[PDB]
Amino acid sequence: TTYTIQLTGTSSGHVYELYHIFSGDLDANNVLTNIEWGAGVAIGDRAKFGDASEKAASLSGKQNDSSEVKAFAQELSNSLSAAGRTRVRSEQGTTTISGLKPGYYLIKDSNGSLDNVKGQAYTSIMLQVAKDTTIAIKSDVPTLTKQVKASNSENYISATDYAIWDTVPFQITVTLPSNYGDFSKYHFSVKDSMTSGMINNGDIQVYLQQGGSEVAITDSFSITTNNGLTVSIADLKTLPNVNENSKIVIRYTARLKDSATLGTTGNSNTASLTYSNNPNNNASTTAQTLDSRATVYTYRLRLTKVNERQERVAGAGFTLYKKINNQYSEVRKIEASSSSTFDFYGIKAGDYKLVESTTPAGYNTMKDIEFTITSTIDSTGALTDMTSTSATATFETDVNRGYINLKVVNKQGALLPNT
Ligand code: NA
């Protein structure tokens, strides 16, 4: 008679090892009788545990995740033999091992099979009776998601647009693995590349989030800028209210430089978590999550001041307004100079009004131009389209470079005839 173990929640690219711990006879109620040591336990190390039947009897009835069982699992891990080993290549989702001799098996990932492999982790060492059932593998990784607050709402997303006058809030959400409780200690280091075209405001806070509440835990972390923006704690177990269901949230703000990337390329940052990847035998190996990217788009509104003779004209000055409600309020003001060109570097989608606050000598003051910018960002976070339209004016756009160009034509007054 042989048996089957099926592991759910498995990933591709693993080699699971089953070590035969106890032999015996399994009945219909999954009671194991006539127990001897399997070949999975090294003959030399069997004396340390004693008689097999009595050792089985000592554990009989104890809960699945009790302390006595997990202690035996760890002790066994140091007492294994290849003579009772079955190795199986993993599959994504479900991994099945059949043709097993009756009895008790220890399951683990193969030693060194996952070193420096991103987004993976060694399973907590399992003990299973082979009994034709499916069991969830006791293996899981933390996740990290980097997001930025939407320009036009409170919700956080992968990509948005912002202006030079805005504060740009970022949020990094970390989940912990379901088997966080099995670790004696847990290395936790978040690295963020930060954004090339932005200045970090240095207002970083860390939060323990669970049960609909947040507690600031910022002082427990080492926050450095020697190698990206790194938020680290040597051992997250030192924070005793952090558990498998806890979320760690990092929030900071930033502002665009006036050299920020314009258009479709955008201003991106990547972040990843470095985490303890093996809960067994107080291992201190680490692995990294895949990068999580956020992107911030911005544009450049250029005015070119000309007259009807198609000459460039100096001495104009423009005040840009943004509409918050019905209320228009000033965001930028370029005074009159010897320049005929005006760059509002760092503008986003929204409703604006443009006012010629200084008129050049010997020309009519233009009427105010109310206009609207739109950004089309697809669900991948990529900027697809941008527009700029007015009732009483026309713009030229280059969505790739992120240019919005307005030609303002100065008209001279009327030299009126007398009679
Ligand atoms: Na796995």
The alpha carbon of residue 340 and the mean position of all alpha carbons in its chain are separated, in whole angstroms, by 45
Report how far ligand 1's centroid is from the alpha carbon of 59 (Å): 27
In the reported structure, the alpha carbon of residue 282 is separated from the centroid of ligand 1 by a whole-number distance in angstroms of 19
Tokens coding 59? 């554990």
| C-alpha 287 – ligand 1 centre gap (Å) | 14
CA distance 269 to 191: 11
User: SS3 letters for the chain?
Assistant: CCEEEEEEEECCCCEEEEEEEEEEEECCCCCEEEEEECCCECHHHCCCCCCHHHHHHHHCCCCCCCHHHHHHHHHHCCCECHHHEEEEECCCEEEEEEEECCCEEEEEECCCCCCCCCCCCCCCCEEEECCCEEEECCCCCCEEEEEEECCCCCCEECEEECCCCCCEEEEEEEECCCCHHHCCCCCEEEEECCCCCEEECCCCEEEEEECCEEEECHHHCEEECCCCEEEEECCHHHCCCCCCCCEEEEEEEEEECCCCCCCCCCEEEEEEEEEECCCCCCCCCEEECCCEEEEEECEEEEEEEEECCCCECCCCEEEEEEECCCCEEEEEEECCCCCCEEEEEEECCEEEEEEEEECCCCCCCCCCEEEEEEEEECCCCCEEEEEEEECCCCCEEECCCCEEEEEEEECCCCCCCCC
User: For residues 355 and 158, what is the distance between their CA atoms, to the nearest angstrom?
Assistant: 34
Measured at the CA of 28, the angle between CA 26 and CA 33, to 5 degrees, comes to: 30
- CB neighbour list of residue 60: distance below 8 Å, 6 or more residues apart: none
What spacing in Å lies between the alpha carbon of 136 and ligand 1's midpoint? 10
Q: How far is the CA of 304 from the centre of ligand 1 (A)?
A: 60
Ligand 1 center–CA 194 separation, angstroms: 31
192 CA to centre of ligand 1 in angstroms: 27
Ligand 1 center to 169 CA (angstroms)? 35
Please tell me the distance between residue 292's alpha carbon and the centre of ligand 1 in angstroms. 21
Rounded to the nearest angstrom, the distance between the alpha carbon of 95 and the centre of ligand 1 is 9
CA of 220 to the centre of ligand 1 (A): 31
3-state secondary structure of 3: strand
CA of 240 to the centre of ligand 1 (A): 27
- The approach used to solve this structure was X-ray
Domain boundaries, the chain: 3-136, 143-296, 299-410
Distance 140 CA to ligand 1 centre (A): 7
Distance 143 CA to ligand 1 centre (A): 15
Ligand 1 midpoint to CA 88 (Å): 12
Expressed in angstroms and rounded, the spacing between residue 127 Cα and the centre of ligand 1 is 16
Quote the tokens at residue 155: 């919700």
Q: 93: CA distance to ligand 1 center in Å?
A: 9
82 alpha carbon to ligand 1 midpoint, in Å? 21
The Å distance, Cα 124 to ligand 1 centre, comes to 10
**Cβ within 8 Å of residue 75, ≥6 positions away:** 48, 49
Strands 341-347 and 299-307: antiparallel
Please tell me the distance between residue 211's alpha carbon and the centre of ligand 1 in angstroms. Answer: 28
DSSP one-letter code for 43:
G
**Is 154 buried (19+), middle (13-18) or exposed (0-12) by CB count in 10 A?**
exposed
Nearest to 170 by CA among 196, 143, 201, 142: 201
Domain 143-296 in CATH 2.60.40.740? The answer is yes
Ligand 1 mean position to 139 CA, how many Å? 6
Q: Any idea which fold 3-136 has?
A: Immunoglobulin-like (2.60.40)
Is the separation of the CB atoms in 368 and 353 below 8 Å? Answer: yes
Q: Which two tokens stand for residue 336?
A: 């009159």
C-alpha distance from residue 238 to each of 184, 186, 277, 392 (Å): 10, 9, 18, 63
The position carrying tokens 């131009």 is: 369
* φ and ψ at residue 103, rounded to 5 degrees: 130, -150
CB 145 within 8 A of CB 172: yes
Helices and strands per DSSP (H, E), number in the chain: 2, 31
143-296 and 299-410: same fold? yes
- CA 113 – ligand 1 centroid, Å: 11
Cα of 126 vs centre of ligand 1, distance in Å, is: 13
Q: Give distance in angstroms: CA of 61 to centre of ligand 1.
A: 28
Enumerate the β-bridge partners of residue 89: 15
Measure 73 CA to ligand 1 centroid, in angstroms: 18
Pinpoint the alpha helices (H) of 49-134: 52-59, 67-76
Beta bridge partners of 271: 192, 292
Q: How far is the CA of 141 from the centre of ligand 1 (A)?
A: 9
CA distances from 384 to 207, 290, 300 (A): 35, 25, 17
Ligand 1 centre to CA of 97 (Å) is: 14
Q: What is the CATH number of domain 299-410?
A: 2.60.40.10
Chain breaks in the chain (C to N over 2.5 A) after: none
Residue pointed to by tokens 């665009």? 256
> What distance in angstroms lies between residue 9's CA and the mean position of ligand 1's atoms?
7
